[PDB]
Ligand binder design. Sequence first.
Ligand SMILES: O=C(O)Cc1c[nH]c2ccccc12
Ligand SMILES: O=C(O)Cc1c[nH]c2ccccc12
Lengths: 134, 134
Amino acid sequence: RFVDDYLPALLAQASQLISSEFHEVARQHGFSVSEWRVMASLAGSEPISIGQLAQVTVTKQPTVTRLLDRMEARGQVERLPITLVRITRKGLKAVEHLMELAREHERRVLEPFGLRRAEELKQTLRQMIDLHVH
Amino acid sequence: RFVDDYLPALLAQASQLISSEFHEVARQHGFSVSEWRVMASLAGSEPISIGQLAQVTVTKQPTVTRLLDRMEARGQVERLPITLVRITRKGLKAVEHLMELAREHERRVLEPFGLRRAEELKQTLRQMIDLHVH
Ligand SMILES: O=C(O)Cc1c[nH]c2ccccc12
Ligand SMILES: O=C(O)Cc1c[nH]c2ccccc12
């Protein structure tokens, strides 16, 4: 069957299944998917452009702008003059424990594969992103 | 930065970027993303359940049911008595050339990585899907 070994289908299924597991945890901790992606993407980061944030969070830029309107109103992020965006201390403290849980979940996902295969997967994915980003 | 090496973020970005490239081709050939996923998933397949189709096409089941209503009206798929679904000859002929283009695009995406790394990636993704599917 074509779909059994078609790379874009494999990537999309693996991504949806693993992400859906963690999204249940995020919601139980009071986060929507989009708020989790924004805060996790900005944590530990220098300010980045709205367009960079949209790419890394895999969210359309007009959707990101609406999201930032409300997250900035809640004091979790700040836009700065191309517009840059950063997480605030309030946002970092809000997301820090969830980030620890995300690392634990990722470790569980990767444990059956071993360190070599896990690092090879992450390296390949990073190289693909850097080759295909606009 | 957390997000630079967080597996779910890497999978989702790689998946979106590679898929968006092929989706431009699909649209230029008159297909929506959802129609392409359904026909490509059913091509060469025995009939599968609606729930299986929803998982492999990464589409919510109520969305799939609406999609199948219109694709069946156009004679591209058929539902059969758990409901099973298959592609028809009309659907297969409609999607065959696009599938060839999809294989060519996939070959281009994977060529910089070489056969060993490409097969390792596909194997890891398949194993992850089979471990995380419900
Ligand atoms: O939601 C997911 O699991 C996928 C994803 C895409 N971009 C992200 C940025 C930060 C954290 C997770 C994600
Ligand atoms: O649209 C994409 O490229 C991802 C995708 C997810 N499930 C699919 C089934 C068949 C073809 C492509 C896909």
